[PDB]
């Protein structure tokens, strides 16, 4: 059952192509410190680069929890908010990020959940925002992007009233993808991933970047461009342009197929 | 049961922190004239300023109706369309606006419903657009913003076919938040409001402005900025900047915590 | 049962105000070649102009299929991708375009389905994207616009896992408008259309352009502008502006009603 | 020569179709207060309604000054934003006539107005970061869509002062004239606008807002779209059939492609 | 020197990779009609398909004129918009060669084209609000994203005429040359473009549109993305496995971060 | 005079609040590599954290050069984009000090930085379409929001070189000075910024990004919004009530309209 790489507050493991970032703080119910986030960013950064991995999954250690948010009940000392760096990271990574929620995903923990491409929910799961009850709020991806899933009314609902939502309430609003019994959530998530690795990783990275460019204006278009520049690089045409530079002569795009 | 402030075609009342704007034209089934809208704008403007109120609710007088739209079956005389001024107002107000629909919310009446942050629906409620049957249309918030709740297909549906939608059909598409029996709709709405007043009014005003900035481009960002400028005003740093102006000397932002 | 206009791979028919574009390639399960698309574009272009038609419907020949996508199992010879020209066309046409799916709507076939204003689904229908399984993807309207119906999570789902979705799964996510037994799908769609032709065609063209301007930034606003310029043209004010040009004298917008 | 309806902290005037809103606080370099803004909101709203008003001009009292922001010396929350928002929902063109210092929330007002005519002694710039505020709304984003991001980021970061000619070359102001001719020119501009159709004008205005204000600017464009729709015979007959309790017949009205 | 395929109201020519669309109605100052636009839509679509065409130029017949809008003298609905839309979905650079009056829907056409080379006798401006129309689409919003909102609001509100140098300083045109050298320069521009890669060009073009056209401009960017994807070995093998009725093996193809 | 923490392919320095990132590869005209970019990402991230750093300057080693893109001579995927993205999420103003050739992905870097101060010998332009790449992200769209679409489409299509004064008139650079005074001026700019409040600065920076970066730029604006919220007494008391296991009392804290 999956290998492992050295971390203090998180777990970074691997199963047959899947990378698994796990929040390993069940005592505090998987709440993150600045160090925790910094470890997650590092873990994802390595997951992005490793050619062996095709799909990433984010989850909590045991049952009962996925993530809680902050706490203080950081290191540096400096009031960091690197939580937001991670938010951006998982959705620029040209690999699907799946949230395997197996309990409470509340506050900051839920925002990490919504920013993940897909969500596998255990029947045990409870979703919600706690910000305005705990003197906080995620007004970025936690608000705008949430509306882009559930509809404005529901997003307005979960932030204002701050209620809890069971797996079925989450499924019924479209927040989560499937709900499976707690025992089966370690499976199913793998079945999902196994289903992705059948498909072209390059087609998936474009579609991910296309979905980001839908919402993130000119920051999302950057990702689309970078994947384009990457594919364009691999074309015989581009080779000619950089060969002519090393050959100090003029480029000859004379005989190359021009598509209407 | 709630106090009151002087109005001719609407009712402006108050219950334990809640302000209640009521369309008082049940004879014409709560349709608005230019005067009605002008009263509603005034009522909301006062609701925005009054430090005693935390949540606003919009509703119709008795049962059977929430709102119908226009009529002519205005004052000035001048063909006003101030209906749109109100639309903008309720969503710049740093207080949640809840639509307590207790019957027909059709035509212009439904657009007022959708622009309200949350919607409490009585089982009695019927929703729809009548524009293209009555030689009209709301192509602004009535179209674009509607899609941002129900999905484009459903928004396209309700405008083209102009069908009626019962409380459950409304709930199933995500248009409304909850459906409660007609007898209980005066409650529940209060329970909702009572639940908001537990949370930080400042966190809520930012989240509201964040949800507007999601859709309203640079007009929504203005609201976000204004709330920022408001909170920045309250910080010791800002005080120093305006003190130095009244003291005619140079500002000293030397010893103030700089966050990464 | 409906007349007809000359085409090789598609059918262009007419019923009491409804135009019916039919993909006539059931042998290949209604997959399109470049010629097929070019015929569809022509058909729609004629449907746009013909004052007799009020609503357009897109569908496949027999049962079992709506559309499959590409194939090669074009003419010119030139690798065309005119599929995208059609995508833009049906949503600039000032007439509702209804997708009458009576079977498989997969791959490119589903994208044509989602771009259609409304969708009438037969119980027989199966929806899905096959791109990353067949070395392709629609990262434009197939990704972004899809999220604007079903929510990001579901759009992310159907592209990454590439699963099939039955009529009810489609209805439950909001992708399709209604589901009716296969026998009744030729009706119902007509009932829908008959319901549109009761309403003002001009109010509908604005609302369509308003829904496009919601998502398509400055390309959608063009459509809104063009409909505006069209209605403004019909006003006595505009007449005066162009009369003064033909009369070589100065325009007199002196006595014309100015609305606040 | 100019007809008046008075206030306490502003001046409100009419001249041959032109309505002129004037800040009347030169001693404090024409700075606004909560109250001064409230008066402007009112005067603009009245100008919105007046059928004889076709163009609105915002100006300072004498020379030397136009607007130097909000002074705070007279819990203060911020209705300048409502005014900015208002003065671009007015279906009437509004021209900024700057004849001195236009700084802080005084400059953002200049920016928000459709066009700016500047007397040669004009001074443009921000104070925000030095005085304990900022205009992160139209003061920042919208300024970039006039001046360009590189230059818009400049004015906010350095808070320097810019003379009339510098404003012209970056693109902040439309025109620059001598101080003596600035009461004129503006009237010429107004005279030139008033001979074009107010409806086409109000639409283009909405089209410019919709380009940037997203869905809120769309409401403006659509709002003026439905007004034109009201005036058509296929619209009124839709409303008449409802009044007469019968099915509407749009059937015989010219279609368009 | 220039090879021709003819029409009734336009001229369509080829020269060493350069295709030239020319309005052929100088008597009415090169104004378009429904028919004239239809011809341009066709000629552009043919230019879209021609593998030997790398750059497109839009110009007027002689000097004096380029385009003065739609005359209406020959129910008229408005296909100019389809043409505007078309001439920015062409994966080929299109340069406006203006040698006289470019006004009304004639100026918006100039605006829509990627670049504008101007002969020194060029005159730019709008007529809309005076003649009973407006271009609230690319005529308004897109013009602001070239000229800046302050100046874009100017040209529509006042409907004044602007000489070549004024257009240059606000940023409307790329370059200004003497009338004699305007047939040249444009060819030089074309010659310069034709030596760069057409694929990188078509992408940047789509990136510029996507920046402003929202989701529609995204379709363009993505559309060119999937074309490049078609030409890769991991794409064709995906399509081949479908044809051969077996499971696709993308497994051994280089990954990227 | 300047204090150093070293790397292999860059230089990283501090001077009275100013941190200076310098590409240290003049032999290849200051071109970056995957590694050189990684170093810059690190150095910027360190500058992000340093409480004593208020302004960041990006520059080339000597004169003649600033950045000429990515050379590729030393599967290469493209972390320059991460750096571009990073250097606009830094709540600190970053100024491009260009003293030579700024071309290709070297020019886009210049563009991404908030402001550009240019030595008179500066040369700006793109190489993409000729060398087998393009910057369809901030290189294209964002460049238009500085220069204007007409001119932004020019630089990419023709790939010409532009001197310092030409960059100034189109609006690419903020200021132009003699080469000798470019180490100065930049420091003056920095000195001028460092006397304004860092919080108002970081907000305006986020407001400028949010204007263009859509929902991602919104995250930045909101992120700085919640930081200010943390420092308020009604926020901490919300967090304290959670720690103390009791119901929060926001009830007695001043409200705003
Ligand atoms: C900048 C930042 O850092 C903040 C952010 O922006 S992110 C948003 C902040 N979010 C929050 O504070 C969420 C509040 N937490 C909750 O609501 C939790 O669900 C809650 C404690 C009720 C836990 O629910 P639960 O299942 O009933 O667990 P419960 O029985 O209450 O408590 C178990 C332990 O979890 C800890 N815990 C759970 N969530 C926590 C959190 N977010 N912070 C700190 N501790 C937390 C509790 O303190 C408790 O620890 P102890 O045994 O030492 O007292
Ligand atoms: C610019 C503008 O002003 C217009 C706009 O943009 S807003 C859009 C305009 N909307 C409309 O016109 C909606 C049309 N109204 C409806 O469909 C109503 O539901 C409708 C009259 C059927 C009422 O439904 P109902 O429950 O069956 O009530 P019903 O039995 O029909 O009639 C009861 C009374 O309500 C009145 N009424 C209801 N809605 C009305 C409306 N919108 N305008 C005028 N009168 C209305 C009816 O005229 C009737 O009055 P009388 O007794 O004097 O004849
Ligand atoms: C640029 C482009 O052109 C491509 C694009 O961008 S659009 C996206 C491309 N999409 C696809 O390729 C979709 C793949 N097709 C499918 O998945 C089909 O549903 C699929 C063949 C399984 C058909 O499902 P089905 O109901 O079981 O039909 P099935 O029994 O498998 O086969 C029946 C016939 O349909 C044909 N067919 C169905 N879809 C086809 C397609 N997309 N292309 C070619 N042939 C297709 C099969 O080849 C078969 O023909 P034969 O009898 O000559 O072998």
* Partner-chain contact B239 D132, CB within 8 Å: yes
Structure tokens at E88: 């920015």
C69 is in an annotated binding site: yes
B184 is in an annotated binding site: no
Domain-embedded: residue D37: yes
Instruction: Clarify whether residues F208 and F234 are in a common domain.
Output: yes
How far is the alpha carbon of D200 from chain F, nearest alpha carbon, in Å?
25
In degrees and rounded to multiples of 5, residue C5 shows phi and psi of: -125, 140
The total number of residues shown for chain B amounts to 260
Q: Please state, in angstroms and rounded to a whole number, the distance separating the CA atoms of residues C85 and C107.
A: 17
State the CB neighbour count (10 A cutoff) for residue E74: 10
Instruction: Clarify whether residues A228 and A191 are in a common domain.
Output: no
State the CB neighbour count (10 A cutoff) for residue C136: 23
Domain-embedded: residue B256: no
Q: Please state, in angstroms and rounded to a whole number, the distance separating the CA atoms of residues D141 and B240.
A: 26
Check whether the bond before B178 is cis (ω within 30° of 0).
Answer: no
Name which of E164, E195, E36 is nearest E96 in CA terms.
E164
Instruction: Clarify whether residues A33 and A49 are in a common domain.
Output: yes
User: Measured in angstroms, how far is the CA atom of residue F245 from the centroid of ligand 1?
Assistant: 10
Q: Please state, in angstroms and rounded to a whole number, the distance separating the CA atoms of residues E76 and E33.
A: 9
Q: Please state, in angstroms and rounded to a whole number, the distance separating the CA atoms of residues D155 and D149.
A: 10
Cα-to-chain-centroid distance, residue C47: 11
Q: Are A53 and A19 in contact (CB under 8 A)?
A: yes
Q: Are C258 and D55 in contact (CB under 8 A)?
A: no
Judged by a CB distance cut-off of 8 A, whether residue E213 touches chain C is yes
Sheet holding A97-101, edge to edge: A10-15, A18-23, A55-60, A97-101, A118-122, A178-180
Domain-embedded: residue F251: no
State the CB neighbour count (10 A cutoff) for residue C72: 10
Q: Are D37 and D74 in contact (CB under 8 A)?
A: no
Check whether the bond before C105 is cis (ω within 30° of 0).
Answer: no
Q: DSSP states of E122-153 as a string?
A: -EEE--HHHHT----SIIIIIHHHHH-HHHHH
Inter-chain contacts counted by CB atoms under 8 A, chains C and E: 143
Beta bridge partners of E208: none
Structure tokens at B103: 């019957």
F70 is in an annotated binding site: yes
Chain breaks in chain C (C to N over 2.5 A) after: 73
Q: Please state, in angstroms and rounded to a whole number, the distance separating the CA atoms of residues C225 and B254.
A: 53
Domain-embedded: residue D130: yes
User: Measured in angstroms, how far is the CA atom of residue F38 from the centroid of ligand 1?
Assistant: 37
Instruction: Clarify whether residues E112 and E134 are in a common domain.
Output: yes
Closest-lying ligand 1 atom to the alpha carbon of residue A32: 3
Instruction: Clarify whether residues F68 and F180 are in a common domain.
Output: yes
How far is the alpha carbon of C198 from chain E, nearest alpha carbon, in Å?
22
What total of structural domains would you count in chain C?
2
Contacts of residue E169, Cβ cutoff 8 Å, sequence gap at least 6: none
Q: Please state, in angstroms and rounded to a whole number, the distance separating the CA atoms of residues E209 and E142.
A: 10
| Interior angle at CA F129, CA F126 and CA F130, nearest 5 | 90
Instruction: Clarify whether residues C189 and C202 are in a common domain.
Output: no
Q: Return the DSSP state at D138.
A: I
Query: Which SS3 state, helix, strand or coil, does residue C69 take?
Result: coil
Q: Which helix (DSSP H) or strand (DSSP E) does residue D238 occupy?
A: helix D233-243
Name which of A22, A30, A10 is nearest A106 in CA terms.
A30
Domain-embedded: residue B253: no
Contacts of residue F207, Cβ cutoff 8 Å, sequence gap at least 6: B221, B225, D134, D136, D137, D140, D141, F221
Q: DSSP states of F15-76 as a string?
A: ETTEEEEEE--GGGTT-B-HHHHHHHHHHHHHHHH-TT--EEEEEESSSEEEE--B------
Judged by a CB distance cut-off of 8 A, whether residue C78 touches chain D is no
Beta bridge partners of C213: none
State the CB neighbour count (10 A cutoff) for residue E64: 15
User: Measured in angstroms, how far is the CA atom of residue C106 from the centroid of ligand 3?
Assistant: 9
How far is the alpha carbon of F106 from chain E, nearest alpha carbon, in Å?
17
Instruction: Clarify whether residues D57 and D152 are in a common domain.
Output: yes
Name which of A113, A122, A129 is nearest A64 in CA terms.
A122
Q: Are A135 and F228 in contact (CB under 8 A)?
A: no
Which member of B149, B192, B200 has the closest CB to residue A132? B200
* Partner-chain contact F232 B203, CB within 8 Å: no
Instruction: Clarify whether residues B118 and B202 are in a common domain.
Output: no
Q: Please state, in angstroms and rounded to a whole number, the distance separating the CA atoms of residues D249 and D238.
A: 7
A229 is in an annotated binding site: no
Instruction: Clarify whether residues D61 and D178 are in a common domain.
Output: yes
Structure tokens at D210: 């919709």
Domain-embedded: residue E149: yes
Nearest CA in chain E to C77: E49
Which member of B137, B150, B174 has the closest CB to residue C203? B137
Q: Return the DSSP state at C205.
A: H
Instruction: Clarify whether residues A110 and A167 are in a common domain.
Output: yes
Indicate the burial class of F8 (C-beta count within 10 angstroms; 0-12, 13-18, 19 or more). Answer: exposed
B23, B28, B33, B163, best to mutate for ligand 2 pocket (most atoms within 8 Å of CB) = B28
CA distances (Å), origin F173, targets A118, D151, F111, F118, F142: 43, 8, 9, 7, 14
Residue A222 CB less than 6 A away from ligand 1: no
Q: Please state, in angstroms and rounded to a whole number, the distance separating the CA atoms of residues E34 and E46.
A: 19
Structure tokens at F181: 């005074």
A69, A74, A104, best to mutate for ligand 1 pocket (most atoms within 8 Å of CB) = A69
Judged by a CB distance cut-off of 8 A, whether residue C197 touches chain B is no
State the CB neighbour count (10 A cutoff) for residue A242: 17
Structure tokens at D48: 């919105």
* Cβ-Cβ contacts under 8 Å, D226 against chain C: 206
Residue B109 CB less than 6 A away from ligand 2: no
Q: Please state, in angstroms and rounded to a whole number, the distance separating the CA atoms of residues F149 and E146.
A: 5
Structure tokens at A41: 């960013």
Q: Please state, in angstroms and rounded to a whole number, the distance separating the CA atoms of residues E253 and D35.
A: 69
Helix axes B108-115, B83-92, angle to 10 degrees: 10
Q: Which helix (DSSP H) or strand (DSSP E) does residue D118 occupy?
A: strand D115-119
Query: Which SS3 state, helix, strand or coil, does residue B165 take?
Result: strand
How far is the alpha carbon of E52 from chain F, nearest alpha carbon, in Å?
18
HSE, side-chain direction, 13 A CA sphere, residue B172: 11
Inter-chain contacts counted by CB atoms under 8 A, chains B and C: 87
Q: Please state, in angstroms and rounded to a whole number, the distance separating the CA atoms of residues F96 and F182.
A: 11
* Domain containing residue C14: CATH number: 3.90.226.10
**Testing the interface with B: which of C115, C174, C178 to mutate, by most B Cβ within 10 A?**
C174
* Partner-chain contact B150 C174, CB within 8 Å: yes
For this entry, resolution in Å reads 2.9
Instruction: Clarify whether residues A123 and A222 are in a common domain.
Output: no
Residue C57 CB less than 6 A away from ligand 3: no
Domain-embedded: residue D30: yes
Query: Which SS3 state, helix, strand or coil, does residue A222 take?
Result: helix
Instruction: Clarify whether residues A203 and A185 are in a common domain.
Output: no
Beta bridge partners of C55: C18
How far is the alpha carbon of B148 from chain A, nearest alpha carbon, in Å?
6
Q: Please state, in angstroms and rounded to a whole number, the distance separating the CA atoms of residues F159 and F127.
A: 6
* Domain containing residue D210: CATH number: 1.10.12.10
Judged by a CB distance cut-off of 8 A, whether residue A157 touches chain B is yes
Domain-embedded: residue A42: yes
Residue A130 CB less than 6 A away from ligand 1: yes
Q: Please state, in angstroms and rounded to a whole number, the distance separating the CA atoms of residues B96 and B199.
A: 12
Closest-lying ligand 1 atom to the alpha carbon of residue A134: 12
Structure tokens at C74: 């074009």
Chain breaks in chain F (C to N over 2.5 A) after: 74
| Residue B236: domain span | 198-248
Q: Please state, in angstroms and rounded to a whole number, the distance separating the CA atoms of residues C150 and E120.
A: 54
């Amino acid at each position: 059952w999956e290998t492992l790489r050295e971390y203090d507050e998180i777990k970074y493991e691997f199963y047959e192509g899947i990378a698994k970032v796990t929040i390993n703080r069940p005592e505090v119910r998987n709440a993150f410190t600045p160090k925790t986030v910094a470890e997650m960013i590092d873990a994802f950064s390595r997951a992005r680069d490793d050619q062996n991995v095709s799909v990433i999954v984010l989850t909590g250690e045991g049952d009962l929890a996925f993530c809680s948010g902050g706490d203080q009940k950081g290191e540096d000392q400096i009031p960091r908010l690197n939580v937001l760096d991670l938010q951006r990271l998982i959705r620029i990574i040209p690999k699907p990020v799946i949230a395997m929620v197996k309990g409470y995903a509340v506050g900051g923990g839920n925002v990490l959940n919504v920013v993940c491409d897909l969500t596998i929910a255990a029947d045990n799961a409870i979703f919600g925002q706690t910000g305005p009850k705990v003197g906080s709020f995620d007004a970025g991806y936690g608000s705008g992007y949430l509306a882009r899933i559930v509809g404005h009314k529901k997003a307005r609902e979960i932030w204002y009233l701050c209620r809890q939502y069971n797996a079925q309430e989450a499924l019924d609003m479209g927040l989560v993808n499937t709900v499976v019994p707690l025992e089966k959530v370690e499976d199913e998530t793998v079945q999902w991933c196994k289903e992705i690795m059948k498909h072209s990783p390059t087609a998936l990275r474009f579609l991910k970047a296309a979905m980001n460019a839908d919402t993130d204006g000119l920051a999302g278009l950057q990702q689309m461009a970078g994947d384009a520049t990457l594919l364009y690089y691999t074309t015989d045409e581009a080779k000619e342009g950089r060969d002519a530079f090393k050959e100090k002569r003029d480029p000859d795009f004379d005989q190359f197929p021009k598509f209407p």
